[PDB]
């Protein structure tokens, strides 16, 4: 039954581990399909966007410190939307893309666009916006895989930039938050049972406040799994709140100005109603659009047919290796379709190619977003979708 499957999976993984050394990466190593969930990393990112109400609360909050707390709430709430067993998303192919949208209770929509911008090393970029609430998010995921011995990790070097476009700072620019990502570990691979943990530091920074949240690992006897600990501070040394609890259970916030008060409930992740993204019908999706590209693999995963899932996945990744070979032969390199390389000194490697003026009518912003890629039912690809972003910005100003 399943104890026999578990033993054979255990052996398969030991046979991979046997040929490694702590500190080296897993980019060359193919992991088995039975540790895959049925979504691409491009879609997995949208798990973290499933609580837009906290972001809407942040946007309407006048007090800067309280607004920061709501941003922290929005960002922490997404992490527990995650697979239950030891599973990871499919690694996207170079140029794979995924679009999705949300129908928000306030009759507005949220839009999401993403693309895998690099394979060596892996990187994807994503863009998310709620134009009628003046909310814009840009980010990149940069996972650097590492075998560590009894554990392995995705060292998460990406980051996220959140802007409230109609909340201006002293320079008359939108209020900006930069949010980093903790690392994702699997521990117990050598002498235990595998379990996924978050670890190390998550940094959230705004113009006037900052929070360094440590994702702790359990002690031998003391502590719990999934514990977090951090302090909300200004840039002048003043500590205002302490966050504690567990990122997949209840998180607590203690007011540090009142030493007698007790930590109060900040986030109870089992009492939250996530808002899942919507996606265009499969019949309208492109060849390298995530759900369509991986449909044969995920169908086999859903019926636990791992020989077929392994073969279908191999054919996709082998085709990508051949395409990469052809690029070398042609003397060219890949360039993303939807994201332009950022200018030096900025927080992100890549930004969506389309210019979206910060203060223009949100109906014009929505129209510009919908021109980037098919998001809503009925939208069609154009010829221009498939040319590089750097050629689309040349024409975005050549006619001007």
């Amino acid at each position: 039954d399943i104890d026999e499957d578990d033993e054979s999976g255990h052996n398969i993984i030991l046979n991979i581990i046997s040929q490694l050394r702590p500190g080296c990466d897993l980019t060359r190593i193919t992991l088995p399909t039975f540790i895959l969930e049925k979504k691409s990393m491009l879609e997995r990112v949208t798990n973290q966007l499933q609580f837009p109400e906290f972001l809407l609360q942040a946007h309407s909050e006048k007090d800067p410190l309280k607004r920061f707390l709501y941003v922290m709430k929005w960002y922490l709430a997404g992490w527990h939307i995650a697979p239950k067993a030891v599973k990871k998303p499919l690694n996207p192919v170079l140029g794979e893309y995924f679009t999705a949208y949300w129908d928000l209770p306030n009759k507005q929509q949220a839009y999401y666009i993403s693309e895998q911008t690099s394979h060596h090393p892996p990187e994807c970029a994503y863009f998310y916006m709620i134009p009628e609430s003046s909310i814009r998010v840009d980010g990149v995921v940069i996972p650097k895989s590492r075998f560590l011995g009894n554990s392995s990790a995705a060292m998460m070097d990406g980051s996220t930039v959140l802007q409230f476009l109609d909340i201006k700072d002293g320079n008359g620019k939108p209020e900006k938050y930069v949010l980093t990502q903790p690392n994702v570990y699997v521990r117990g691979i050598l002498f235990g049972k595998m379990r996924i943990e978050l670890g190390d530091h998550m940094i959230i920074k705004s113009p006037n406040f900052q929070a360094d949240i440590e994702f702790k690992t359990k002690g031998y006897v003391f502590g719990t799994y999934d514990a977090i600990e951090g302090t909300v501070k200004d840039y002048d040394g003043n500590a205002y709140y302490e966050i504690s609890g567990k990122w997949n259970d209840v998180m607590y916030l203690k007011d540090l100005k009142q030493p007698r008060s007790s930590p109060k409930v900040f986030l109870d992740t089992h009492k939250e109603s996530p808002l899942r993204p919507k996606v265009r019908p499969l019949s309208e999706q492109g060849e390298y659009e995530s759900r369509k590209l991986w449909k044969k693999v995920t169908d086999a995963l859903a019926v636990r047919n791992h020989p077929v899932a392994t073969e279908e996945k191999f054919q996709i990744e082998d085709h990508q290796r051949q395409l990469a070979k052809k690029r070398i032969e042609d003397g060219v390199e890949f360039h993303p379709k939807l994201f332009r390389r950022s200018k030096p000194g900025e927080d992100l490697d890549y930004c969506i190619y389309k210019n979206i003026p910060v203060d223009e009518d949100p109906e014009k912003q929505i129209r510009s977003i919908l021109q980037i890629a098919p998001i809503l039912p009925g939208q069609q690809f154009t010829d221009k979708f498939f040319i590089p972003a750097f050629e689309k910005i040349k024409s975005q100003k050549k006619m001007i």
Binding site: L338, I366, L370, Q371, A373, P374, G378, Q379, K384, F385
Partner: peptide, 19 residues
């Protein structure tokens, strides 16, 4: 430059009563 065709009416909250 547009990579996608638009819906006939750009959706907003100000025309959701129609939709």
């Amino acid at each position: 430059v547009a990579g996608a065709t638009l819906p006939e009416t750009i959706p907003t909250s100000k025309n959701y009563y129609l939709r």
